Amino acid sequence: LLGDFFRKSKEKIGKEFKRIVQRIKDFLRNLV
Amino acid sequence: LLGDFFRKSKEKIGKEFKRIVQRIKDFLRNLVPR
């Protein structure tokens, strides 16, 4: 399972960078 | 809570980079013939 550890740590970091992008788009739409 | 959202998201990303460094140090020690 060492190769299974390196694959699942990367998927986790990519999923949090995507939650930051959607919050910025909601603030700027709420002002109109 | 907008300023509380940005502070807690940075803390979470730094904790995962530190788990990767400790797993690499444990592989290299276990090879010693002794």
Q: What is the DSSP letter of B7?
A: H
Selection from A28, A7, A20 nearest residue B7 by Cα:
A20
What lies within 8 Å, CB to CB, of A20 at 6+ separation is B9
Q: What angle do CA A7, B16, A22 make, to 5 degrees?
A: 85
Quoted resolution (Å): 1.9
CB-CB under 8 Å, A5 with B16: no
**Experiment used for this model:** X-ray
Give yes or no for B21 touching A (CB within 8 A).
no
User: Per the structure, how many domains does chain B have?
Assistant: 1
Domain that holds residue B19: 1-34
Please say whether the beta carbons of B20 and A9 come within 8 A. Answer: yes
Q: Inter-chain contact B20–A27, Cβ cutoff 8 Å?
A: no
CA B31 to chain centre: 23
Q: What is the DSSP string of A14-28?
A: HHHHHHHHHHHHHHH
Tell me if chain A has a CB within 8 Å of the CB of B23: yes
Distances (CA, A) of B5 to A15, A25, B2: 16, 14, 5
For an interface test with A, which of B4, B7, B20 has the most A Cβ atoms less than 10 Å from its Cβ? B20
